[PDB]
Write an enzyme that holds these catalytic residues in place. Structure first.
Site, PDB file in Angstrom:
ATOM      1  N   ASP A 118       0.842  -1.195   0.000  1.00  0.00           N
ATOM      2  CA  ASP A 118       0.000   0.000   0.000  1.00  0.00           C
ATOM      3  C   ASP A 118       0.880   1.249   0.000  1.00  0.00           C
ATOM      4  OD1 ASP A 118      -3.243  -0.087   0.901  1.00  0.00           O
ATOM      5  OD2 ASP A 118      -2.217   1.863   1.041  1.00  0.00           O
ATOM      6  N   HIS A 128      -3.436   5.843   4.103  1.00  0.00           N
ATOM      7  CA  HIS A 128      -4.237   4.696   3.693  1.00  0.00           C
ATOM      8  C   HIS A 128      -3.598   3.383   4.152  1.00  0.00           C
ATOM      9  CE1 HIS A 128      -5.807   1.857   0.577  1.00  0.00           C
ATOM     10  NE2 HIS A 128      -6.902   2.591   0.661  1.00  0.00           N
ATOM     11  N   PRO A 182      -8.424 -15.229 -10.441  1.00  0.00           N
ATOM     12  CA  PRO A 182      -9.260 -16.214  -9.730  1.00  0.00           C
ATOM     13  C   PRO A 182      -8.621 -16.786  -8.475  1.00  0.00           C
ATOM     14  CG  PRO A 182      -9.289 -16.613 -12.102  1.00  0.00           C
ATOM     15  CD  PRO A 182      -8.266 -15.557 -11.872  1.00  0.00           C
ATOM     16  N   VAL A 202      -6.710 -15.733  -6.044  1.00  0.00           N
ATOM     17  CA  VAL A 202      -6.557 -15.003  -4.795  1.00  0.00           C
ATOM     18  C   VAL A 202      -7.925 -14.872  -4.139  1.00  0.00           C
ATOM     19  CG1 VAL A 202      -4.536 -13.849  -5.699  1.00  0.00           C
ATOM     20  CG2 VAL A 202      -6.796 -12.742  -5.884  1.00  0.00           C
ATOM     21  N   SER A 246     -11.036  -1.316   0.147  1.00  0.00           N
ATOM     22  CA  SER A 246      -9.724  -1.259   0.775  1.00  0.00           C
ATOM     23  C   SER A 246      -9.769  -1.519   2.270  1.00  0.00           C
ATOM     24  CB  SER A 246      -9.117   0.131   0.578  1.00  0.00           C
ATOM     25  OG  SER A 246      -8.687   0.315  -0.744  1.00  0.00           O
ATOM     26  N   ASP A 279     -26.820 -13.508   4.396  1.00  0.00           N
ATOM     27  CA  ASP A 279     -27.276 -12.477   5.323  1.00  0.00           C
ATOM     28  C   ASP A 279     -27.145 -11.047   4.797  1.00  0.00           C
ATOM     29  OD1 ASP A 279     -27.979 -14.382   7.305  1.00  0.00           O
ATOM     30  OD2 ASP A 279     -25.874 -14.542   7.905  1.00  0.00           O
TER      31      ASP A 279
HETATM   32 CA    CA Z   1     -10.788 -16.396  -5.726  1.00  0.00          CA
END
Ligand code: CA
Length: 279
Positions: free
Chosen positions: A39, A69, A175, A177, A224, A260
């Site tokens: 970051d 941040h 995909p 991660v 973030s 939910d």
């Molecule tokens: Ca994934």
């Protein structure tokens, strides 16, 4: 353990219901794990980090977080008051300048840095990386995130704040991660949160209190802010022996609060990160 009057997001990730204010967690608190915050940097000297944070790499003239941040994200991972995993080690990698932006080549370099640097750190319970950044689709950025995950790091990435399908953003669209959307305290999808079939999980992302530069604190919003809740949860679970870096995203999805959330478009998961802690 019980932390009263905790930030709502901490309370939410240890609850089956919205509307509570105490954070419940096992006292091991991520000890022996490590989280890289990729970051704008981390203000390590902040007392809230208790000496557990350190800058390990910068691509700019300084390693100081001149933005805030990265310090806020690190605080949600692992600060004493505002963090999920209150005993984890925090490692800052400054790929974003003090205006909060960075070139994709620098972001890629920082990911490859973490994949190697973890071999220089003591993380017996496992390694996590929290990426609260992103831009438009890039196969190179996605392949760097995939390499980092393949190397044995649990990679959590922000879905993005475009109220759009995350398929068009990177590293959100990779995909392999753990792609994290944002929710609010009333269990709505945050208005700005991206969505889509590539999301793995939601975490708290609207009005999140955490650390800031100058030894301060503030509340801000974004995917973030959701991402470090999931990264900290992974570190916490890996210290407890429940999962590993390669399996943590699936484990979190398996154990999440299911069905939910409101304003979840058809085809997007309705899963909210949950620590399942029973004192
Ligand atoms: Ca994934």
């Amino acid at each position: 353990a019980a932390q009263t009057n905790a930030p709502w997001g901490l309370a939410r990730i240890s609850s089956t219901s919205p509307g509570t204010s105490t954070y419940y967690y096992d006292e091991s608190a991520g000890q022996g794990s490590c989280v890289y915050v990729i970051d704008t940097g981390i203000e390590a000297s902040h007392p809230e980090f208790e000496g557990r944070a350190q800058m390990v790499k910068t691509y700019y003239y300084s390693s100081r977080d001149g933005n805030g941040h990265g310090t806020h994200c690190a605080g949600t991972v692992g600060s004493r008051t505002y963090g999920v995993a209150k005993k984890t080690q925090l490692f800052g990698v400054k790929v974003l300048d003090d205006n909060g932006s960075g070139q994709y080549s620098t972001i890629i370099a920082g990911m490859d840095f973490v994949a190697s640097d973890k071999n220089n750190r003591n993380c017996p319970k496992g390694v996590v990386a929290s990426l609260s950044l992103g831009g438009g689709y890039s196969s190179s950025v996605n392949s760097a995130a995939a390499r980092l995950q393949s190397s044995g790091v649990m990679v959590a990435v922000a879905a993005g704040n475009n109220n759009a399908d995350a398929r068009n953003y990177s590293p959100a669209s990779e995909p392999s991660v753990c792609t994290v959307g944002a929710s609010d305290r009333y269990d709505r999808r945050s208005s700005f949160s991206n969505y889509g079939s590539v999301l793995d999980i939601f975490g708290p992302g609207t009005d999140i209190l955490s650390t800031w530069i100058g030894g301060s604190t503030r509340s801000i919003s974004g995917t973030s802010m959701a991402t470090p809740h999931v990264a900290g949860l992974a570190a916490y679970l890996m210290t407890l022996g429940k999962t590993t870096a390669a399996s943590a995203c699936r484990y979190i999805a398996d154990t999440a609060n299911k069905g939910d959330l409101s304003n979840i478009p058809f085809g997007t998961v309705n899963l909210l990160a949950y620590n399942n802690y029973q004192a």
